[PDB]
Structure formats: C-alpha cells, structure tokens
C-alpha cells in the first residue's frame, strides 16, 4: 500500500535511525519482542506503513543499515531493542567494512559490492505491489555516510524511476577544522547529488543543535548522546498524518507535493517547540492552540543557521504548521485567523502563499494525550546563507593547496571541483530570481 | 402582588420547577386587616431568594465587570494592546472586511494577557 523503505547509512545515520525505530514501539503500544498491550489496534488504527506487515503480530522494521565502521552496530545487539531487528535482512553477526575514512572509499566500494548491495535490499521491494519510495537516512559528516550515499542516489534513480525520493539528512558541524579537514570536499559532492539526483531533502544543521541543546536542556559538556533526542521525535512527528489515521496529505507524496516550488529548491526549514518535561504541570488548565503557532514563525525553534537581518528581502512561499494530539479543533481556524494580521511571513510578490495546518490524534499515552505539540516544515528563501557559508569555505580551501594532491590518487582524474561550484551558484541565483 | 407574580412567571418559564417561593405556600386568612401582613412576608422571601440565585449562582456581578473592563476601560493592559491594534486598521476609511479583522486583533490582545475571567469577555462583540 504505502510502504516506505528507510535507507539508514553511515556513522551518524545509523544512530539517528536506531532510536527512530525505538520511538515507534513506545507509541504503538508494542514491545520489540512481544505484544503485551492491547492498545495497538483500538488506539492506533494503522501500523503497517513503516513496519513490515505482520506474520505473528511481529511488526518487522523495513530497515537496512550499512556502514564501514563496525562500532555503531556493536552498540546495538546488547540493547534489548535489537531482537526486533532481523539478522538476515541486512547482515548476520560479525559484519565489517573498510579501514576507513575517505569520500572516495565508499564511492569506489559501491561497484565492487554491486552484486550484494542490490540483492537483499530489493527483496523488501516486491513485498508490496505499490511501493511508496525510498528515504535515505544518511549523513553528510564524515566520509562514510557521504561516500557511499552518493552512489545510491544515482543507480536508484533509473532502476526505480516512479518512486519518491526525499531524505532526512544531517548537516555537519563547522566550529573548528582540526579533527576533520575534508569537510568542505565530501559535503559539496553529496550536495550536488541532493538537488539533481534527488527530489527533496530535510536539512538538519549541527551548529543549530547545540544552540537548542543549551537553550532549555541545560548541559555543560556537549556529548553525542543528545543528538538522537531532537532528531527522533521530529521524524515520527513528520509521519503523524501517515502513521496515525489522517485524511489530507496522509502520504509522504502528499506533504512534499504541497511545499516544493520547483526542483533544486527543496530545502525545508524545521521547527519544534515542546521539549521540556516541567511544562506538564500547567497543561492541565486547557492550554489552547491559539498560542502555539505564534512562536513557530518567530525564529526561536529553528534548526537552520541563517542571518537575522536577511529576512526582509526574502519571502516565505510555503509554510507547514502541524498540530498533534489534543487540538481543540473549534479554535484551529481561530489560530489561522491571527496569521494575516501580523504578517510574520513575508509573502512572495509574484504569486500566492499558503499556511497549511493539519491535525492527527497521537498515541494513547499520558505524555502524548496531554501536551500540545507543534511541528513546523517551513520553506524560506534565506537558505542560501548556508550555501554562501559552504561555498566561501570551499573556494578558500582550494587556494591554500589543501587536499589537491592527497585526494586525486584514487578514481579521480579530472577536476570536478568547479562542476560543484557552478551548480551550487545555480541554486543560489535561482532562489533570488524566484521572487520577481 | 403584581410584581411577585411577574417574578413567578419568569421563573416558571425557565424550568417550571425552579420557583422562588418554595417552602412558603401557607394559605390565606379571613381578616379585615391582617392580609396585607400576609403579603408582607410573601414579598420579602420571594425577592431575596431571587437575588442571590442570579447574582452569585449565575454570576451577574461578573458580567458588569467585563462591561467595566471595556466600556469604562478599567483593565487597560489588554485594552491598550487592542487600542494600538485598532490604529493600524482605522488609519483608513471603513470597509466591510475591517470588522472581521478587529475581532482577530481583539482576541489576540485578549489571550496574550492570559486572564481567567476571559470567558466573560468572549460575550463581547464589535460594532463598526
């Protein structure tokens, strides 16, 4: 019916998808090894849209996880949520990889394991006779997720041409350049494949993570154990129309169709306010829906590093405001009434704009059926500031003679560096041209 | 005896069993003088138990407060927020779609001021 195959790949893409499947059992009322609660069918009306359909009421995840590093998968099998995963769909015990840290490693390893990489991931494709598409849950940081992920964006474009492609990709961190220095090279090589060899992306910045991780979360030493908490909730938040029973844009080709203006303009800004557990003691007094979307357009919950004074000459075109759970829908048109009076979104002068709001009932659970949740999927034309940030860090590195002799020994014979530079400037010029 | 039965019909038309002179239905007397003293105890209870039901159990004292907060402009914290918000819409001659936008900014000035007697302010309409 609407079966999606997630493509978890890389050192960071496997960990953000590990707790994504772990989030799904707590809201479906199911255990990874059994069914102890009856809340799975009376409370939740649809479960076989991301999981594989049941053979013994055991909803297998439709997931594949490949990585060169064996460290990310050795921290999985000792956890009690790995018995839900199957040891025959992806790998058996003692799976390995390369050495290995290179963008050209996984780019060259795709055609030497070409027979095996297109054998076991295609067995899940013909399980349903109407496949939705493929989401590449991969990474941009490092050479593991960026090297091999650029290969599958090409060969799955023609072997599966009538399928939706759209990824939840995480952006790397640009604070210092000591541990990694190959960061401007492997990022722009995948970013070219994300626009012409891929339809849509969902950007997730790393410098904007610790802006939120010290905002309300109150940590002193930033660890990697907090990167899975902001990411796994908004992943399950994006499929609330798709997993839980909704009516309009209840498919993944429903939501993405109403937000993309044009190809190579698909970078969607994400926002999510409620992350604090001591808000729970004051939501008993009928906290309404009239105050939760006034702060979405206000740049506080954003996960995109952008300029603060560059929003006057940029214009919103498509903005999504997803409320979940208890909505009190007699005032949801009242919340959309107050949008035109502030004009917090700059509107495009050539065409109409749209503020789309939708709702779906959440899990039968006490932290879910009590507190209001707001998921934002914006589309603003100030996203070229990240593309100006990555390009200015790209041409400055090529004048310092950095990784021009250390990178072209394997499988690179011609200069494909300006092939990425002009196509990035094509994106940056067509964005500003789009508001005439 | 006119005004008592005026009270008794408007409480008969409300519930037909919610009548004010309950537990006082004592019969009349045959006397040349003392039947006005019979009326003098029938008045005093029937209008007293009509007062506290409307004023306290139906909160008619709270309805004049919301009248005071807007017409007399007493609670001015939400009001000057709304009064600043009538400025950007009345800096032009009046149109038909403007009162559909005044109620947008009224309840946007209301629930940013987070009061708990706000159900008494949802009975307010805007005339332009």
Swiss-Prot record, chain A:
SMART domains: Tubulin, Tubulin_C. This is Tubulin gamma-1 chain. InterPro entries: Gamma_tubulin, Tub_FtsZ_C, Tubulin, Tubulin/FtsZ-like_C, Tubulin/FtsZ_2-layer-sand-dom, Tubulin/FtsZ_GTPase_sf, Tubulin_C, Tubulin_CS. GO terms for cellular component: centrosome; cytoplasm; gamma-tubulin complex; gamma-tubulin ring complex; mitotic spindle microtubule; nucleus; polar microtubule; spindle. It comes from the Eukaryota. The keyword Metal-binding does not apply. One of its GO terms (molecular function) is microtubule nucleator activity. It is found in: Cytoplasm, Cytoskeleton, Microtubule organizing center, Centrosome; Cytoplasm, Cytoskeleton, Spindle. Tubulin is the major constituent of microtubules. The gamma chain is found at microtubule organizing centers (MTOC) such as the spindle poles or the centrosome, suggesting that it is involved in the minus-end nucleation of microtubule assembly. The keyword Cytoplasm applies. GTP binds at residues 141-147. Keywords: Cytoplasm, Cytoskeleton, GTP-binding, Microtubule, Nucleotide-binding. GO terms for biological process: cytoplasmic microtubule organization; meiotic spindle organization; microtubule nucleation; mitotic cell cycle; mitotic sister chromatid segregation; mitotic spindle organization. The gene is tubg1. PROSITE patterns: TUBULIN. Belongs to the tubulin family. Its main location: cytoplasm.
């Amino acid at each position: 019916p609407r079966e999606i195959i997630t493509l978890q790949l890389g050192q960071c893409g496997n960990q953000i998808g590990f707790e994504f499947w772990k989030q799904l059992c707590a809201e479906h009322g199911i255990s990874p090894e059994g069914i102890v609660e009856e809340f799975a069918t009376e409370g939740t009306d649809r479960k076989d849209v991301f999981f594989y359909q049941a053979d013994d009421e055991h909803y297998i995840p439709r997931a594949v996880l490949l990585d060169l590093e064996p460290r990310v998968i050795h921290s999985i099998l000792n956890s009690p949520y790995a018995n839900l995963y199957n040891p025959e769909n992806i790998y058996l015990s003692e799976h390995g990889g390369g050495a290995g840290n290179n963008w050209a490693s996984g780019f060259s390893q795709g055609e030497k394991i070409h027979e095996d990489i297109f054998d076991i991931i295609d067995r899940e494709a013909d399980g349903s006779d109407s496949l939705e598409g493929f989401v590449l849950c991969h990474s941009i940081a490092g050479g593991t997720g960026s090297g091999l992920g650029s290969y599958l964006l090409e060969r799955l474009n023609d072997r599966y041409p009538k399928k939706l492609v759209q990824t939840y990709s995480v952006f790397p961190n640009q604070d210092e350049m000591s541990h990694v220095v190959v960061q401007p090279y492997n990022s722009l090589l995948t970013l070219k494949r994300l626009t012409q060899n891929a339809d849509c992306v969902v950007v997730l910045d790393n410098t904007a993570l610790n802006r939120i991780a010290t905002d309300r979360l109150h940590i002193q030493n930033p660890s990697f154990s907090q990167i899975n908490q902001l990411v796994s909730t908004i992943m399950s938040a994006s499929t609330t129309t798709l997993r839980y029973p909704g009516y309009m844009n209840n498919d993944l080709i429903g939501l993405i169709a109403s937000l993309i203006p044009t190809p190579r303009l698909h970078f969607l800004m994400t926002g999510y306010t409620p992350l604090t557990t001591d808000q729970s003691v004051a939501s008993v007094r009928k906290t309404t829906v009239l105050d939760v979307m006034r702060r979405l357009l206000q740049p506080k919950n954003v996960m995109v590093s952008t300029g603060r004074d560059r929003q006057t000459n940029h214009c919103y075109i498509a903005i999504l405001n997803i409320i979940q759970g208890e909505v009190d829908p007699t005032q949801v048109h009242k919340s959309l009434q107050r949008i035109r009076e502030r004009k917090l979104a700059n509107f495009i002068p050539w065409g109409p704009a749209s503020i789309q709001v939708a709702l779906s009932r959440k899990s039968p659970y006490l932290p879910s059926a009590h507190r209001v949740s707001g998921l934002m999927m914006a589309n603003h034309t100030n996203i070229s500031s990240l593309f100006e940030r990555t390009c200015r860090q790209y041409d400055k590195l090529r004048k310092r003679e950095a990784f021009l002799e250390q990178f072209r020994k394997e499988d690179i014979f011609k200069d494909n560096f300006d092939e990425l530079d002009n196509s990035r400037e094509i994106v940056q010029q067509l964005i500003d041209e789009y508001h005439a | 005896i006119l005004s008592t039965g005026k009270y008794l019909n408007v409480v008969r038309e409300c519930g037909h069993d919610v009548t004010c002179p309950d537990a006082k239905e004592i019969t009349y007397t045959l006397k040349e003088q003392a039947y006005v003293e019979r009326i003098e105890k029938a008045y005093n209870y029937a209008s007293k138990v009509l007062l506290d039901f409307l004023m306290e159990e139906e909160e008619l004292v709270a309805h004049l407060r919301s009248i005071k907060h807007y017409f007399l402009m007493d609670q001015g914290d939400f009001f000057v927020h709304f009064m600043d918000l009538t400025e950007e819409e009345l800096k032009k001659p009046v149109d038909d779609i403007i009162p559909t936008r005044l109620e947008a900014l009224l309840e946007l000035a209301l629930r940013m001021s987070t009061a708990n007697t706000d159900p008494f302010k949802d009975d307010l309409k805007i005339e332009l």
